[model samples]
Target: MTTVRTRIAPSPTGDPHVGTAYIALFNLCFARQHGGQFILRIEDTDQLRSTRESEQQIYDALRWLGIEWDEGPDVGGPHGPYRQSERGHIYKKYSDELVEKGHAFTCFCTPERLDAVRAEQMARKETPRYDGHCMHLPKDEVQRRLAAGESHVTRMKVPTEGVCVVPDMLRGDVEIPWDRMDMQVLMKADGLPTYFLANVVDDHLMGITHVLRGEEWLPSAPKLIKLYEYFGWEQPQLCYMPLLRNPDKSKLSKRKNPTSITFYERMGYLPQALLNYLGRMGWSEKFTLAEMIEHFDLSRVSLGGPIFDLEKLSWLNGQWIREQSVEEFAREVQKWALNPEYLMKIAPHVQGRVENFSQIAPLAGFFFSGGVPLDASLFEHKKLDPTQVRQVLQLVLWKLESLRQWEKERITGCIQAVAEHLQLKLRDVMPLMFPAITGHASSVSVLDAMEILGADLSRYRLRQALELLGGASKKETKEWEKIRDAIP
Candidate 1:
């Protein structure tokens, strides 16, 4: 029996993209169904953007979505050094082999020269490609150029007349004419392998038997098949799934919507719910992770672009939330409270405001931020004059400065005392407190908010609010500065 093996190679550029999860879900489902190995490979060849933080995010996001791999950078496997950046010598060896076999050639063409050729071709209304300027260079010249250390890249030698039939599992054979193909770069002068060479070499060497990816790579299938043929290797079964798109039928992008997997996680979408929504995008139907693994059939995957409707995902998330008991839901959401220090203190203030985990951030963000911005207009009260509001704030500031206790009850009592002393309604005084402390016109109790903000932040916010209101008065600012300075 041919052992079935599949892999998902995601680039660690930024947040783990939803597209990566989308492809990975299908790949892992397929692998799981066949009782085969699911592998995770990090394609971090773009050294500039790749980061350990971003890489860890990929692991964390996928695991949260219940997509586990048999092997990964975090887990050892027989295919050691799974990251492409770590397997440079392996790619170099294959690239060298291709060159030695005349399957590829060293191209010393400078970027300027290549650009001129492409420009000329475009001017003639022809498809731009390398004109094989360096393809026919004399052996002695090639050796001398190498000895002189002239910068160059290696380009694959493509047949000019033949038709390369690329087998797509879902869409049938895709015929790509060789004349339309460029002699693509296999290795860079910086001693790094291009995606073309690295991807092919790694997939083959990693023992990957299936290649399931988005349709964007369909155009490159012909070249990949050619590489397989050049090496006398069997090509993996190819499945080119349709791209996920926005409601506008445009490609799903961060510009269009939050495409990061973490976006869904942070927003409090259940991992199971998100996985379900993603499974239904191009596959059979909405299903739990286990059901997806049980029912996932590659042949059933649609070729049409899947619309990533956030509304639908929210509905699915609502269903997931409802299915959980109150305790289960609370336990699940606790993981999203990234700030352990503030979790208990901040939970009560924002708990009722959130429908999903994501709402907690915006609802309570002021608590964690360095300073919350306030619109001076938010301070305006219907029944009180601006001066009266300023007076109320100044009076409250003086009262809070000397207060020893920081409990919510004490904070509430102090505010009421200030309102009574100023001969103002509690309602008018309360509105001012919300904007001054929380930087919003409405939220949980102002007393509760200030208590969570603690004495230092609470006092600082009152001062910040005073300055925002153009400073109660220069004399008031100086007085507040002295009070703030006096705090131990």
Candidate 2:
């Protein structure tokens, strides 16, 4: 019955990632369950890497998934400046107070020395850590360095003995020994407080009572707890939620997994289906999003990492899609996929050629972008012969170049004309060209490539292919044109 205040802080540095949303859902539900405030804070401390585009994505993605916050950069509340970047002065005040109170110290270690010390520890098969060289430097010399205008970073002063315990709602008690703790950097050389320092300080100041986060931060909880002790303040409860893992039990990596929420959005996944699948991962398996909020127990969710099985998610999404009517499906698909602006670019290519859904889909698919597979092998792994690739690339490139306008019909006509000019089958040449242009074997077509690659570059790729093939044969460039006319 404690006044529970929970928060989910997301870094706005890249695409709106799904894990961010996943964590937010749990935090929001936990706060609402106890009639406490659920807050969203922006962790934009890494100023160099963060962008406005990424911040916009965080807002857009959360709204799309129906997640809202009581207070955030997007929606103002009591904690007026919810962004960490704007709260730099607050962090500085606490850091200076910590320094003055003997709870932290400034270190002036150069990169080369730190690297060498780390290498030496690794050579000795020991955990590499800060040598605490600056921790005991004489006051006079420290003052001299400061007066000399040499730069230094602030480090938390962790005690050398005893264990720090962080109680979790799901995982129970977790312990970290003092020896395992690093003299964590509070403020970086660039003046931005490190994530941990800013995070702990801000959480306390904002009156957050319960901290629910991924298990990755369990080791650092001791430092944060020690920080609270140093400041003579009560510590908030800590809950270490299990990590979202791949089906194989390995950590979910961006490279190996579809972690981007936008990626799923682009793949025509319904928001409800995605939320349902995510809900099933952690807690009560019987409730919908609203029902789950009421019945949700932070303590019941397993401490063991939850598997993000793609097969399970796909099956769930299929069910959602199948259960809906054609009108409902169209609304869902159009909400995620259709844009009249995009339709304008795509309709011309298939207008006369497409008579039904089958024909229109193939011609129109290119306009539907997202989930463009970046895996190089998806396009060229082992399917096409090198020469066939060269021919396809050349033909498509030429067709793109000859077009007077960059619209679909002009793009499609140029490609269709190539096969006739060469007395070749469209079936044979088009199939070979599919993968290279779309970055996937199954896609809109070579015409989509013209749209995807744009006019000039699309044409240039053909010119490159022609040069690669020794500037085309006299048969293809000159004699072939006359030969095609003679044959027809």
Best by TM-score: 2
Whole-model alpha-carbon lDDT for candidate 2? 0.73
State every prediction's TM-score relative to the real structure.
Answer: 0.73, 0.76
> How many steric clashes between backbone atoms does each model show?
1, 0
Q: Report the C-alpha lDDT of model 2 over 251-364, residue by residue, as the tens digit.
A: 887535657776677666777778777778887533367887987887768657888888888888888888879999987776654756556656665675666868776545
Give one digit per residue, the lDDT tens place, for model 1 in 1-488.
Answer: 88889999998876678899999998899998998999999999988778877788899999999999999899989986989999988988999999999999999999899899989999999988899999899999999999999999999988889898888888888888888888999999999988888889989988999999998998878888899989998889998889899999998865457676765665567899888999998678456888888988987777789999989999988988998799888888667544575577777767788889988777788776635797888887788787766767777876785565668887777777777655666776887888788888887777887876766567767867866776566776675556444433
lDDT of each: 0.83, 0.73
lDDT of 1: 0.83
Stretches > 4 Å off in candidate 2: 285-287, 324-326, 347-360, 368-488
Candidate 1 local lDDT, residue 236: 95
TM-score of 2: 0.76
